[PDB]
Structures are given as C-alpha cells and as structure tokens.
Design a protein around this ligand. Structure first.
Ligand SMILES: *[C@@H]1O[C@H](CO)[C@@H](O[C@@H]2O[C@H](CO)[C@@H](O[C@@H]3O[C@H](CO[C@H]4O[C@H](CO[C@H]5O[C@H](CO)[C@@H](O)[C@H](O)[C@@H]5O)[C@@H](O)[C@H](O)[C@@H]4O)[C@@H](O)[C@H](O[C@H]4O[C@H](CO)[C@@H](O)[C@H](O)[C@@H]4O)[C@@H]3O)[C@H](O)[C@H]2NC(C)=O)[C@H](O)[C@H]1NC(C)=O
Ligand SMILES: *[C@@H]1O[C@H](CO)[C@@H](O[C@@H]2O[C@H](CO)[C@@H](O[C@@H]3O[C@H](CO[C@H]4O[C@H](CO)[C@@H](O)[C@H](O)[C@@H]4O)[C@@H](O)[C@H](O[C@H]4O[C@H](CO)[C@@H](O)[C@H](O)[C@@H]4O)[C@@H]3O)[C@H](O)[C@H]2NC(C)=O)[C@H](O)[C@H]1NC(C)=O
Ligand SMILES: *[C@@H]1O[C@H](CO)[C@@H](O[C@@H]2O[C@H](CO)[C@@H](O[C@@H]3O[C@H](CO[C@H]4O[C@H](CO[C@H]5O[C@H](CO)[C@@H](O)[C@H](O)[C@@H]5O)[C@@H](O)[C@H](O)[C@@H]4O)[C@@H](O)[C@H](O)[C@@H]3O)[C@H](O)[C@H]2NC(C)=O)[C@H](O)[C@H]1NC(C)=O
Ligand SMILES: *[C@@H]1O[C@H](CO)[C@@H](O[C@@H]2O[C@H](CO)[C@@H](O[C@@H]3O[C@H](CO[C@H]4O[C@H](CO)[C@@H](O)[C@H](O)[C@@H]4O)[C@@H](O)[C@H](O)[C@@H]3O)[C@H](O)[C@H]2NC(C)=O)[C@H](O)[C@H]1NC(C)=O
Ligand SMILES: *[C@@H]1O[C@H](CO)[C@@H](O[C@@H]2O[C@H](CO)[C@@H](O[C@@H]3O[C@H](CO[C@H]4O[C@H](CO)[C@@H](O)[C@H](O)[C@@H]4O)[C@@H](O)[C@H](O)[C@@H]3O)[C@H](O)[C@H]2NC(C)=O)[C@H](O)[C@H]1NC(C)=O
Lengths: 427, 119, 119, 119, 119
C-alpha cells in the first residue's frame, strides 16, 4: 500500500458519457475563521505532485489582487498520505520563506530522489513578463527535502545560483510553469524564451487564415508578442539541469517545435502511465487546449491533440472558441492530467464561460467530448487559475486540484483544493 | 468525525510560564504529525512548533526558537506545549492541526485557545 | 448593547504621526455616520473629522483642515485617523460616536483614547 | 526582616484532603526556592515537597511521592500544598523555608502550622 | 438627606487591579473625612484606607499598608480606591463613610459594593 503516481494497471474507469453526477468533490483545504478580514489577496499558485510528495507557493498581496505589494511568499513541500480511510491529503512538513518578499517571481518545482528543487526567477524590476527590457536574467533554485532531520543545516535548505547559461539565440531564460519532470538523474523545468522580434524567421504565409476571413495575415507575427510594437517575442521551451555532473550549474533551454507555435504560456510537462505528457496554456490566437504526449523529450516534439470542446475564456477581443489569428494576449490557465492512455482520457478543472471567468467546473473528456462534469462551486464564484494533478491510492486513481475560488465569508480569492476520485462505476 | 479539543488558558504576567494542551480522538495518533498554529487579531497564520510521529524531528519558528519545545504523548492522545518566557507579542489564539503552517488543515477548527499576555 | 472600542496611541513628539483606531459592533456599519470627537481637560467637545456612510462627504474643522483625513473601511468595522503634523494644542482624549459635534451621542462612551503631544 | 506567615489547619479524617498555604514578603519571590518541612513531636526534620524558581523541578520524598504535589504561584507570593490521601503518620507541624531538608534555614520560623490526622 | 452611592468592580481574578468608586452629595466635600470600610460575611468592620480634608494625611491598615493608596477629588465629589495586588482574603463588601473605623457613621449605608476575589 502507498500513494504513488499513475503506474502499472489501475482499475477500470467510466468510459461512457452520463449526465448522472458520479464525481464527489471533497474539500481538504478547510481554513480557520478569518474574522477581522482585510484587503488580503492570494495569487501566483503552484501545485506539483510526484511519488507521494507535494509543494505549494503563494504571494499574499495586501490590497488589489493584481497591482499589489509583497509581504510573504510561503514556499513549502510535504508528504501525501491518507487521512485515515480512503481519503488522501497533503501533509506539509517543511516551510521556507525568503527574506525580501518582492524578489521571487515565477517559480518552478521538480521532484528528485529525496529532495524537491524549486527553480524561481530573480528580478529587481517586478514582474519579468512586464519589464523584461531591463531584467538581468539571474535564476535561483532552492532545494527543500521532503524529510527533514535534526541539526542538518545542509539537508533542509540549500540555495545555489545558476551561473552558466547555454542560451543559443535567446536573450533571456526564465522558469515559466508549475513543474516539470525527471528522467533518471536529469531535471527538466518548464520555461519561456525571450527572442528579438527583428531576429525572427517566420514566413507570413503559413498563418492559418484559410477559414479566417476576418483576420489579417500578419496576425500570426503580431500575436507572438505581448504587444504589436514590443521588443521581444515569447517562445516556450524547457530547462535541462543534469544534477549528476555537478561541475557547474548549467542551463539548457531547448525551444519547442513549430507545430501550432503560439505565444509563451505556462507549460506543464508530466509523466502519465510511463510516457511524459506535455501541456501548454493558450494565451494567443489559439483558444483551444494544447494537449498531447511527448515522443522526443528534448526538442519538445509533442503530438498536439485537436480538441474542439475544451477551451478557456477571455476578453471581448479573443473570447472562447475563437480558432482564428487575432492580435491578443489574454486567457486563463486551466490544465489537465492524463488518467488513461489506451483511450486517452484526461481530467481537469476547466472554466465554463464565454467572456467571463466564473463557474469553475471539473470536467472529464477523452479527446472531443465531455464524459461527466461536476461543479466545484456555485455559478457565480470567480476563478482565474487552476492546477490539476492526479495520482493513485493503492488501487485506484485520485485527483487533487487547486482551484482558486471566491469564498463567501472570506471576501478573498482562496485557492481551495478539492479531492475528486475517478469512479469505477457510472450510469 | 475528527474532534479537536483545545485547552490551556491566558491572562498571565509578562515572562511567565504557561502550558497549553490539545487532545484529539479518531485518527490514529501513534503515527501522524501535530503542530501549534497561532493567529493574532489583525494578522493571519503564524506557526510556532512542529513534531513528527516518532518524535524524531522538532521544528520551531525564528521568534519562538528558544521559547518553548513541543512534546508528544503517543501513549495517551494529547499535545502539550510548555510555553516559557513569553512576551506581549505572543498574545494570540493557538490552534492544533495536522500541518506545520501551510494553508492546509483537514478538520474544522473546533474551539481554539486564547492566550493573553498583558499587564 | 452598542460597544465602542477606542484604540490608537500616544506620547509622541511634537509634529509626529499617529494613527488612532476605533472598532465597533452591533449596529449595521454598512450605512451610518462616524466622527472623531476630542476634549481637553478644562474644555468641552471639539470635533475634528467627519465622514458619511458611502465615503462621499468628508468634513474637517478649521484647526485640523489639513492635519489628518478620516477614512472608512466598511468591509472591516473600524474607524482610522492618520493624525499628521500635530502640535501641543492637540493633547486631548479622542472619542468616536455617531454625531459630528452636537451635544448628541446615542451610546455610552466606553473607554476613549488619550493622545499626549509634549516634550 | 523576612516574615513567614504559615496557614492551614488540621483535625481531618484519615484519608482526607487538606490544602496548606504559606505566604511571604520581603525577598524577591520571582527567583528562589521553597520547600515544606514537617516535624512530629519526638522526631526531627522531615522534608516532603520541593520546587524550583521556574517550576521546572519538583522533588518529593519516598513516603509522600504520590500524596501531594507542590505548586508555585510566583504572581502572588504564596506556597500551596494540596495534601491528598494522608494517614495517621502525617500528624505533625508543617513549615515553609528556603532549604530542601538540610540543617539550614535563613529565617526564624515564625508560627508554623500543625496538622492533626486522627479519629 | 445624605446619599452615598457606592460603585466599583468585582468578580476579578486574584492579583489583578480593581478601582472602587463612591460619589456623594449634600454635605460640603471640600473639607471632610472619608474612609473605605469593608466587612466579610462572618466578620465585622475592617478599615483599609483613610483620606483627610486637604489630602495631607493618608492612613492605612497593617494588612493593606502597601496594597492600595486612597486619593481625593475635592473638585468633583467622589472617592476612588485603586486596589492593586489583592488576595483571597479581600473578598468582602466595601463601604464609604465619614469615620475611619470606629463604630460611628452618621448616614445609612446605601447600597455598598461587593468585591469577590476567587478562582
Ligand atoms: C521598468 O524598468 C525600468 C528600469 O528597470 C524602470 O525605469 C526606472 O524608473 C525608476 C523610477 O522608479 C528610475 O529611478 C529614478 O527615479 C527617480 C525618482 O525620484 C523620486 O521619484 C518619486 C517622485 O518624488 C519626486 O518627484 C519629483 C520628480 O522630479 C521631485 O521633484 C520631488 O522632489 C520628489 O522627490 C519619489 O517617490 C521616489 O521616492 C524618488 O525619490 C529619478 O529622480 C531618477 O532620475 C535619475 O536618472 C535619470 C536617468 O534615468 C537622469 O536623467 C536623472 O537626471 C536622474 O539622475 C530615476 O528616474 C530608474 O532610473 C529607471 N531606470 C532606467 C533604466 O531608466 C521603469 O519604471 C519600469 N517600469 C515599470 C512599469 O515597472
Ligand atoms: C515565403 O512565402 C511566400 C508566399 O508563399 C513565398 O513566395 C511564393 O513562392 C511561390 C513558389 O513556391 C510562388 O508560386 C509561384 O511562383 C512563380 C514564380 O515564377 C518564377 O519562378 C522561378 C523563380 O522562383 C523562375 O525560375 C520561373 O521561371 C518563374 O519565372 C509564379 O510564376 C507562379 O505564378 C502562378 O500563380 C499566380 C498567382 O499567384 C498566377 O497569377 C500565375 O498565372 C501562375 O499561375 C506562382 O505564383 C508565389 O508566387 C510566391 N508568392 C509571392 C507573394 O512571392 C516565398 O518564396 C517564401 N519564402 C521563403 C524564404 O520561404
Ligand atoms: C548526467 O551526467 C552523468 C555524469 O555524472 C551522465 O552519466 C554518464 O553517462 C554516460 C553514458 O554514455 C556514461 O558513459 C559510460 O561509459 C562506460 C565506460 O565504461 C567502460 O568503458 C569501456 C567500454 O568502452 C566504452 O567506451 C565508451 C566510453 O564512453 C562508450 O561510449 C562505449 O560504448 C564503450 O561501451 C570498458 O572497457 C571499461 O572497462 C569500462 O567498464 C560505457 O561502458 C557506457 O556504455 C557509457 O558510455 C558515464 O559513465 C556516466 N557518468 C557517470 C559519472 O556515471 C549522464 O548520462 C548525464 N545525463 C544526461 C546526459 O542526460
Ligand atoms: C448515479 O450513479 C450512482 C452510482 O453510485 C447511483 O447510485 C447507485 O444507485 C443504485 C440504484 O438505485 C443503487 O443500487 C441499489 O441500491 C439500493 C440501496 O442501497 C443501500 O442499501 C442499504 C439500505 O437497504 C444501505 O444501508 C446501503 O448503504 C445502500 O446505500 C439497494 O437496496 C439495491 O439492492 C441496489 O443495490 C446503488 O447502491 C447506488 N450506489 C451507491 C454507492 O449507493 C445513482 O442512483 C445514480 N443516479 C441516477 C439518477 O442515475
Ligand atoms: C457563447 O458563444 C457561442 C459561440 O461563440 C455563441 O453561439 C453563437 O451565437 C452567435 C449569435 O450571434 C451565432 O452567430 C450567428 O447566429 C445566427 C443564427 O440565428 C439565425 O439563423 C438563421 C441564419 O443561419 C436565420 O434564418 C434565423 O432566423 C436566425 O435569425 C446567424 O445570424 C448567423 O448564422 C451567425 O452564426 C453563432 O452561430 C453561435 N455559434 C454556435 C457554434 O452556435 C453563444 O450564443 C454565446 N452565448 C452567450 C450567452 O454569450
């Protein structure tokens, strides 16, 4: 018995589309009374899970939830065990907080033998995705063990700087994504690249403007950047860090393939049933979900899934279900974890709205149809970012998803974590 | 249903010595984690102690690193906290849960225990 | 029973910056009036700052027109007063009530808060 | 001059429960040692209970190891002793001093308190 | 007709700080004597504090020589008593009159004020 990841052969799960709600959302984030509440705000979440160990990160802002300040950034790992009877939970064991809260931005986690590296970006100009024209590029990776000991001083917290960077043509690298994966003795981190717009080689004749009459041809080139008259175009990729050499801290940013090349968005690569699955958010002309399994791990050659029913909402410019080139940088992060490979069954908390960001609903879809959905809250609570991770509980698949909702008696966007079990019997 | 029963008391002189207790029932106490979490009116979560199942690891905060030491009584389900040399900045309501500080907690906080250090 | 809990500070240097607070419970705070009232030993009532329910009207006195500005935090029932550029003539006990100056006040003044500006 | 005011009476049934108290003044009670010393007519000194300044060490004798437990009240200068499950061999006069048993003593024994356990 | 309205607090933790008040009307308070008198259920009169007319002489008892100090407010007819560091032997009803202890008193004791010091 033990809380492991998707390995071996799990039990038979529901393979049919039923309207009968067979999903049981279980809340495991019971917070204490916040009587005497203030203008607090919790944003920038992180949730990684691997072999029964989790991690969390959050930046509490006092005031506005976007243009706020930094007071504390609680980054800690822990163990994933049972609460006592067939209900898993996230038990934290180690907590780390940096001295200056307004330095750390855009962290990335990874799993190891008996440690948990947290690769964060260091900036002295604020949000690096907003003032990249003056950012240095220094990156700091913090190692936190999942099992602390007494008077270690070298086994509970050890930071190191990544001096050597193997940037070929990109001007800056930065960890951008919840977490990555490991391949034996090598660490991989999701990231985005910063490349000059005048140094881009993309013929403006491959833009999917066939059945897109209401779209200009240069929309593909204008969508690769945050703004049309910007100075950098984002490019997704991964950071390689082989902790077996240890001759010097190395950074290897391998760019993503050209198939369905979109703007830089939080990537998420995870292992499912042996094969690594890759995910990429949609903050560009393509509003549908970018799903697919990895066949070539290094160059990020991923067979993208052409799902036509799962997408993310947006503003009036680029709303949901808009598969045409348009100059826009907007969207919401909504991922999904693969629970089956024979039928390619995925599961994740995706929003259900046209031009709004409310009603967070957990939905299960194979490739082009929704199997069974379940609402984690009411149809008026807002939600911005969701992180979905699935695992096993000794005989069966279990999924814990961090969904930022709007609690009634909190008046603050609270990242409530639910526990949804994939059922083995449906109607 | 997990029931957490906090105990102890407050209204002590500055620099005194208090002993907070918190018993529990339900889940198996012989192998689990316990931690004291306090919160002052106006502020949020602030952990002060941590202990493992076999009492092999005991973590504390920077402000209470040498104030008190958490213990474990796996024989008779309880959670003691021998608070020593407290100040006026320790006036808050303490809570016992199954997480160091986090934002976690898999049980409704039952009653808590307020500790007042003033005058 | 309406309970008024005054807070803040005192014993500040001439020309400092203090922040007085006053929380309340009972009556609905979402739509009502709040006002700071001070009184020196020997004198009577002296109104300084007034604010409406929707924070649309903020009145001040001739002597404290530019000293401090009253705010409103209807989400969390309180009454702040960021006293700035005070002098020796501002040494008095401040009180919060539901009347601008008047001779009015529809609740017993609970404790008040003394502010001393000297030496 | 150090004054020791002993209190508490006797004349209790065998196996009852009495509470002896002893207040003091003068010397600083926040950091010192207190000990109960009894003596029966015909015998000599007999120590029963000891306690430290910070209430971290509490020693007892072989005959009263489980009878009573000495406490400390550093806030209000006193010395309580919740005598429980006494016998006929505990009929003696109790005294409070600043030495465990010894032959020592840094103050004249003022009045004492006789406890009778018979019939 | 002389009316003595006793006031103050009670039911407090032992070792705290209470402030008993007693206002009066009628006789000229600018030149007269006032004294606090208490009595426990079972015992008789027991004087604690005395104040003179011009606040030049303040006498106290042997048991409360350093507990509290009486004051005088000849401007506004009252009688304060800042009881500090009280014990369990101070659980009694306090009264104000025009005689130190005596058996005297030229006015009916109006209401009194019970002060309970226990637990
Ligand atoms: C994206 O990143 C870039 C670079 O990383 C950011 O650009 C940087 O902006 C900062 C400003 O925050 C520049 O720093 C200096 O700011 C000084 C401001 O002084 C005060 O400003 C506030 C206003 O208070 C004052 O107002 C007036 C202004 O004249 C005064 O008369 C008055 O008395 C007040 O004192 C105060 O609140 C604050 O505390 C400061 O005390 C400037 O004075 C300073 O100018 C120097 O540098 C100039 C060259 O840039 C030079 O020409 C001047 O002569 C002088 O020497 C400077 O602006 C950084 O220098 C600037 N970086 C770069 C590379 O230019 C950008 O803001 C950021 N954007 C976002 C959205 O994050
Ligand atoms: C970036 O993307 C653009 C757009 O796709 C590319 O430009 C196009 O290239 C294709 C070729 O693959 C062009 O298609 C045809 O080009 C012919 C060129 O004629 C000469 O071709 C070679 C030189 O390459 C000579 O040796 C030869 O002798 C010819 O003289 C045209 O003649 C063709 O015309 C046909 O179509 C037009 C309609 O477009 C009809 O009106 C004609 O009657 C005829 O049927 C044909 O066009 C295409 O025209 C190019 N488009 C543009 C806008 O230039 C770039 O090559 C590409 N660049 C890179 C680096 O990838
Ligand atoms: C991360 O970094 C770690 C290092 O810390 C990498 O681990 C290394 O992985 C390489 C894999 O190529 C290991 O290289 C191995 O070398 C073996 C040599 O031992 C035997 O050599 C003779 C056989 O001839 C070999 O000659 C070359 C040598 O490289 C081979 O390529 C040939 O194929 C022949 O096999 C014998 O006669 C001799 O007696 C020795 O027994 C070789 O046998 C292996 O096949 C392999 O090539 C290297 O040793 C590893 N280093 C460590 C410290 O373990 C890891 O790969 C990095 N991760 C990445 C890159 O993702
Ligand atoms: C949606 O899917 C759900 C999947 O769990 C469906 O729930 C199942 O519904 C069927 C049909 O009603 C039940 O089968 C029957 O259950 C009854 C009642 O079981 C109870 O029996 C005793 C009381 O006698 C009680 O102590 C137990 O705890 C059971 O709760 C039986 O009496 C019948 O013989 C028969 O087995 C399933 O039991 C039930 N699942 C569970 C887990 O209970 C649900 O009905 C579906 N809804 C719709 C609208 O289709
Ligand atoms: C959420 O987003 C969905 C997808 O974007 C929305 O569905 C779309 O709604 C628009 C509404 O303007 C449709 O656009 C037009 O639909 C009408 C159809 O009505 C007329 O149909 C025939 C002509 O075909 C006519 O004879 C009838 O008398 C009707 O008057 C037409 O004007 C056009 O055909 C045009 O398509 C989209 O078609 C529709 N998309 C899909 C996939 O259904 C949805 O409405 C949004 N909901 C909210 C609440 O915002």
């Amino acid at each position: 018995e033990g809380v492991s990841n998707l390995v071996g052969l799990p039990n038979n799960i529901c393979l049919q589309k039923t309207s009968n709600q067979i999903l049981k959302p279980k809340l495991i984030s019971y917070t204490l009374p916040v009587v005497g509440q203030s203008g607090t705000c919790i944003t920038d979440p992180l949730l990684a899970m691997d072999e029964g160990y989790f991690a969390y990160s959050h930046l509490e802002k006092i005031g506005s939830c976007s243009r706020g300040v930094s007071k504390q950034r609680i980054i800690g790992v822990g163990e994933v065990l049972d609460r006592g009877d067939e209900v898993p939970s996230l038990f934290m064991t180690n907590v780390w907080t940096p001295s200056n809260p307004n330095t750390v931005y855009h962290c990335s986690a990874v799993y190891n033998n008996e440690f948990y590296y947290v690769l964060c970006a260091v900036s002295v100009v604020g949000d690096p995705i907003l003032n990249s024209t003056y950012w240095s590029g220094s990156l700091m990776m913090t190692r936190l063990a999942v099992k602390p000991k007494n008077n270690g001083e070298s086994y509970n917290q050890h930071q190191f700087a990544l001096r050597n960077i193997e940037k070929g043509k990109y001007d800056k690298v930065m960890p951008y994504g919840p977490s990555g994966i490991k391949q034996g003795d090598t660490l991989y981190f999701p990231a985005v690249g910063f490349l000059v717009r005048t140094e881009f080689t993309y013929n403006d004749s491959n833009c999917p403007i066939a059945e897109c009459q209401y779209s200009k041809p240069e929309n593909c080139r204008l969508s690769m950047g945050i703004r049309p008259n910007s100075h950098y175009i984002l490019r997704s990729g991964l950071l390689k860090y082989n902790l077996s050499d240890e001759e010097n801290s190395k950074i290897v940013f391998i760019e993503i393939s050209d198939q369905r090349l979109s703007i830089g968005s939080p990537s998420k690569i995870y292992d499912s049933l042996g094969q690594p699955v890759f995910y990429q958010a949609s903050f560009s002309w393509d509003t549908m979900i970018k799903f697919g399994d990895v066949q070539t791990v290094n160059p990020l050659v991923v067979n993208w899934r052409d799902n036509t029913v799962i997408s993310r909402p947006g503003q009036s410019q680029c709303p949901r279900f808009n598969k045409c080139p348009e100059v826009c940088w907007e969207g919401v992060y909504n991922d999904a974890f693969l629970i089956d490979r024979i039928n390619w069954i995925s599961a994740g908390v995706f929003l259900d709205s046209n031009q709004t960001a409310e009603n967070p609903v957990f939905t299960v879809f194979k490739d082009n149809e929704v199997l069974y959905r379940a609402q984690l809250a009411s149809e008026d609570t807002n939600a911005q970012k969701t992180i979905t991770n699935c695992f096993l509980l000794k005989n069966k698949i279990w999924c814990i998803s961090l969904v930022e909702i709007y609690d009634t008696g909190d008046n603050v966007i609270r990242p409530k974590l639910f526990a949804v079990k994939i059922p083995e019997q449906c109607t | 249903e997990v029931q957490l029963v906090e105990s102890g008391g407050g209204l002590v002189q500055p620099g005194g010595s208090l002993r907070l207790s918190c018993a529990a029932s339900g889940f198996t106490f012989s192998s689990y984690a316990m931690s004291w979490v306090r919160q002052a009116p106006g502020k949020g979560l602030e952990w002060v102690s941590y202990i493992s199942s076999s009492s092999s690891y005991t973590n504390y905060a920077d402000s209470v690193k040498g104030r008190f030491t958490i213990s474990r009584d796996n024989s008779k389900n309880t959670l003691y906290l021998q608070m020593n040399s407290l100040r006026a900045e320790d006036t808050a309501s303490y809570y016992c849960a199954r997480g160091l500080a986090g934002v976690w907690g898999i049980d409704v906080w039952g009653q808590g225990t307020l500790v007042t250090v003033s005058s």
